[PDB]
Coordinates of C-alpha atoms in Angstrom, one line a residue:
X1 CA 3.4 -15.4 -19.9
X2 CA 1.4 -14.2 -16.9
X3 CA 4.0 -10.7 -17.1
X4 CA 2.9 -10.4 -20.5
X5 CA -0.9 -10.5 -19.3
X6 CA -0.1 -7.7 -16.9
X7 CA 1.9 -6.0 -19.1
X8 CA -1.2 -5.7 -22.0
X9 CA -3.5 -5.3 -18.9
X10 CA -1.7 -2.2 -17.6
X11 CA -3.9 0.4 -19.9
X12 CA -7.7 -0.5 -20.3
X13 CA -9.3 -2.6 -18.3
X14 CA -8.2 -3.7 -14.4
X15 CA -10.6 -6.9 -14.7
X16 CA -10.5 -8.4 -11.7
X17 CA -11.5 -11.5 -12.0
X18 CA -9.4 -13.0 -15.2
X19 CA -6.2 -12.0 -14.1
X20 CA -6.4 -10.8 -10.7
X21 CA -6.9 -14.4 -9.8
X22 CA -4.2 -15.6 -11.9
X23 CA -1.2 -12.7 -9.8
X24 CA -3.2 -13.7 -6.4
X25 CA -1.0 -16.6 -6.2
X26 CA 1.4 -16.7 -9.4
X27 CA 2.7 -13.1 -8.3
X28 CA 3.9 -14.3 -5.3
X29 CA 5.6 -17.1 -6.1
X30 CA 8.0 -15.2 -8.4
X31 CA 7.9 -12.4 -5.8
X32 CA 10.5 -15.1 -4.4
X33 CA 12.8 -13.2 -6.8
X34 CA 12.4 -9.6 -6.8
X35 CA 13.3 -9.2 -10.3
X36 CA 10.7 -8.8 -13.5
X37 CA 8.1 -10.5 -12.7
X38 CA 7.7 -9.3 -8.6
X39 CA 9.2 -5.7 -10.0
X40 CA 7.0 -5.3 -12.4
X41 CA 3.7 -7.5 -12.9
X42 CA 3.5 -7.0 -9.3
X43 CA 3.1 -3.5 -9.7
X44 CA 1.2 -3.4 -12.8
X45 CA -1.6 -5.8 -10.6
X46 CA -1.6 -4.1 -7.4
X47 CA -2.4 -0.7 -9.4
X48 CA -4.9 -2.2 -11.3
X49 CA -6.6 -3.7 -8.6
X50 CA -8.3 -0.6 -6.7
X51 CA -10.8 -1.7 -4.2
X52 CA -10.6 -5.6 -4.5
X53 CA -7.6 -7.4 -3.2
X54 CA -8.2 -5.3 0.2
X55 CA -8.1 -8.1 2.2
X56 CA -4.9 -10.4 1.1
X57 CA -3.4 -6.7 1.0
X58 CA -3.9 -5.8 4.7
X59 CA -1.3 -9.0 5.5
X60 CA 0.5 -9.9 2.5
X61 CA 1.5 -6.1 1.6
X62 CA 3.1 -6.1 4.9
X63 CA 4.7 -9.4 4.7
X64 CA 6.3 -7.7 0.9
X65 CA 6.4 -4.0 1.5
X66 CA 9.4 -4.1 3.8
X67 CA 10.5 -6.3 1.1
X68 CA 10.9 -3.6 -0.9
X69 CA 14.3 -2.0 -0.1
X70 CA 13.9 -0.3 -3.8
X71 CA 11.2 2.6 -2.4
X72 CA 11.1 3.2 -6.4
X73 CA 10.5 -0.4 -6.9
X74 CA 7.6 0.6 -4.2
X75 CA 5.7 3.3 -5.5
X76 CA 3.5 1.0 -6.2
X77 CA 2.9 0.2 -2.2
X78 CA 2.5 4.0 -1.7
X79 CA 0.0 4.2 -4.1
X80 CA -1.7 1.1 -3.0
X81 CA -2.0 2.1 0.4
X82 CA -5.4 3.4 -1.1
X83 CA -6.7 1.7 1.6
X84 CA -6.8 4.7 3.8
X85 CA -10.9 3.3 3.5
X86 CA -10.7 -0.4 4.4
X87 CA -8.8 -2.2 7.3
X88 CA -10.4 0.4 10.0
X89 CA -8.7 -2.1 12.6
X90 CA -5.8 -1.9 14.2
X91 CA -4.3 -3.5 10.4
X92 CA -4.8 0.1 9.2
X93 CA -2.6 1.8 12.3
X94 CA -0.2 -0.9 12.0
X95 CA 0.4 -0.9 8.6
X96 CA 0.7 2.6 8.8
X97 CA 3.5 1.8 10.8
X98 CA 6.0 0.8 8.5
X99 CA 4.7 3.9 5.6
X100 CA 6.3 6.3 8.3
X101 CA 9.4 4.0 9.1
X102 CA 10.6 3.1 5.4
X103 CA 10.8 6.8 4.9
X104 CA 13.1 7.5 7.9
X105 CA 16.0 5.9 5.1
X106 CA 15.5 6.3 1.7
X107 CA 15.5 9.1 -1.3
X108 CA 12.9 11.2 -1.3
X109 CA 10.6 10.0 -4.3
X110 CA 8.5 8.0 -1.7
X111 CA 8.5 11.1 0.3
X112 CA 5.3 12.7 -1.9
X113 CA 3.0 10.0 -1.6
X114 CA 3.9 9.3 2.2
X115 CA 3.0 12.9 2.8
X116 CA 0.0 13.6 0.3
X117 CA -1.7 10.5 2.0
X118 CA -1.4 11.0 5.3
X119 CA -2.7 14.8 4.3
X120 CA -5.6 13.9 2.8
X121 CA -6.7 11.0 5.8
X122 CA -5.2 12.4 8.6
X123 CA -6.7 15.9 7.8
X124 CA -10.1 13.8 7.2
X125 CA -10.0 12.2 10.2
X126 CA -8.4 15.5 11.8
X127 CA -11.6 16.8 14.1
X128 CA -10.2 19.9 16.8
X129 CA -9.4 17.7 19.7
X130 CA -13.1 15.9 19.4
X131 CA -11.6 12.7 19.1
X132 CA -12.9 9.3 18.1
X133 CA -11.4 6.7 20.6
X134 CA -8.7 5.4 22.9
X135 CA -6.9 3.3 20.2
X136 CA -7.2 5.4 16.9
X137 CA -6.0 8.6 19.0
X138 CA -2.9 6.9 19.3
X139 CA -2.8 6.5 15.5
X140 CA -3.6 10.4 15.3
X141 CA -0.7 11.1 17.7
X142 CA 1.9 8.9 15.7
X143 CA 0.6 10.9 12.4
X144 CA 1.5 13.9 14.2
X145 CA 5.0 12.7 14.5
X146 CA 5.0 11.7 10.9
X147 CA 3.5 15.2 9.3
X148 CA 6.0 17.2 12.0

């Protein structure tokens, strides 16, 4: 039923309250599978969602993401990592992490968003050598590896 919701919800509205509740904790439980529900209503919520949802993103997405052997199946966790914004902590550099080391494997389809992201943040952030701070530097130094 809940896939259904998503499934309507995809085109008009991204509420989140009514449903975004509801995949909080349903989506996970048939995340267990992988299949359908995860797949899909996954996707269709975590592209809905936007700007709420930050916060069970900056662990949970990292507990799936990984998860995600199917990069297709994740172009939904390229696109969510929207966050470039929120999780300023060290959950931002870390979770970086992983962006950079699912693509030293798969197809290249991932390849876009991992690249057009880091483009757009890491030339934001990019200042000529005026730096910010001892620990995000090292995040600006690991994006160097990633871009070169």
């Amino acid at each position: 039923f809940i896939v259904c919701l998503n499934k309507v919800t995809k085109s008009f509205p991204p509420l989140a309250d009514r449903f975004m509740n509801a995949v909080f904790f349903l989506l996970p439980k048939f995340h267990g599978v992988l299949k359908t529900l995860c797949l899909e209503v996954v996707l269709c919520r975590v592209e809905g969602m936007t700007e709420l949802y930050f916060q069970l993103k900056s662990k949970d997405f990292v507990q799936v993401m990984r998860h995600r052997d199917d990069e297709r199946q994740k172009v939904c966790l390229d696109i969510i990592y929207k966050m470039m914004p929120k999780l300023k902590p060290v959950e931002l550099r870390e979770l970086l992490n992983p962006v950079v080391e699912f693509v030293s494997h798969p197809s290249t389809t991932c390849r876009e968003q991992m690249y057009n992201i880091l483009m757009w943040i890491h030339d934001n952030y990019r200042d000529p050598e005026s730096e910010t701070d001892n620990d995000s530097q090292e995040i600006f130094k690991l994006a160097k590896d990633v871009l070169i």
